[PDB]
């Protein structure tokens, strides 16, 4: 009458199944040691700028470390390589209006926003960084302003001998001449029609950088505070690439808190009351657009 000992057979079947289960649990532990795979990767190649990196052997556009001559320590940038050997150094980008561009002097000096390998994030590199890249010895830099509206059209604006001054000069925007492009020369000023002095007071050529906490414009009040941005303000602007992102494009005076256009504008291409969908500011050594 052995109804028992049969329970020992299942007990031996259980113990054996518990022993091998612990071995399978130990196998599971080994696969759960890795962290989450980050898509964002920094490339190993470094140099003076994105062009110097492109000369070293870099092919794809992504995130790179650069170190200018007079810079204290290296910093991250987004480089654009088109396959022709050209390496653009992007310092400003606008896409969706996710990043707020109403920032102070220190935030515009050091930089704000985010840097993506795909180039789909909004950022301002920082006035201190742009100055160190642009004012490298001998060869000057060429500024390219890429603009895109909500219809799908694209326009470019080129500027020769692009230079940003030091912090002591309040980061002054200086260039030799307007190289060309279908976007037009908005840094020269625009005749809006409101006053015969519009062309003179909307020019950005030889103008100091201005934020809400640091006023350096040719206006009695504060251009950077009224428009809510950091820009080389005059009285006040014709091109306003760091402005408020208006969804759709067309915005009226009623949408503005002050009563003065503050959207991403470029008077030479579109009207005063039109905000751009995409904006890109990138620089390259001027010898690259030669031969």
């Amino acid at each position: 009458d052995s109804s028992i000992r049969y329970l020992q057979e299942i007990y031996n079947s259980n113990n054996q199944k518990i022993v091998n289960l612990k071995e399978k649990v130990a196998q599971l532990e080994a696969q759960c040691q890795e962290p989450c795979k980050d898509t964002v990767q920094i490339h190993d190649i470094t140099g003076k700028d994105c062009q110097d990196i492109a000369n070293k052997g870099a092919k794809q556009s992504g995130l790179y470390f650069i170190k200018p001559l007079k810079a204290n320590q290296q910093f991250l940038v987004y480089c654009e390589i088109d396959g022709s050997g050209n390496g653009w150094t992007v310092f400003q980008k606008r896409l969706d209006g996710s990043v707020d561009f109403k920032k102070n002097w220190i935030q515009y000096k050091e930089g704000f926003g985010h840097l993506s390998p795909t180039g789909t994030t909004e950022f301002w590199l920082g006035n201190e960084k742009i100055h160190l890249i642009s004012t490298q010895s001998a060869i000057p830099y060429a500024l390219r302003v890429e603009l895109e509206d909500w219809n799908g059209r694209t326009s470019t604006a080129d500027y020769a001998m692009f230079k940003v001054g030091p912090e002591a000069d309040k980061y002054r925007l200086t260039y030799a001449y307007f190289a060309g492009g279908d976007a037009g020369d908005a840094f020269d000023g625009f005749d809006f029609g409101d006053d015969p002095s519009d062309k003179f007071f909307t020019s950005h050529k030889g103008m100091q950088f201005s934020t809400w906490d640091n006023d350096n414009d040719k206006f009695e009040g504060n251009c950077a505070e009224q428009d809510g941005s950091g820009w080389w303000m005059n009285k006040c602007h014709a091109g306003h690439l760091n402005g408020v992102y208006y969804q759709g494009g067309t915005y009226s005076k009623a949408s503005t808190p002050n009563g003065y256009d503050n959207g991403i504008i470029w008077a030479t291409w579109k009207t005063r009351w039109y905000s751009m969908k995409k904006t890109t500011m990138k620089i390259i050594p001027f010898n690259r657009l030669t031969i």
């Binding site: 809006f192 409101d194 519009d198 909307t202 206006f219 251009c223 009285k235 006040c236 602007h237 008077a267």
Partner: peptide, 4 residues
């Protein structure tokens, strides 16, 4: 833009 411009200021009056």
């Amino acid at each position: 833009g411009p200021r009056p």
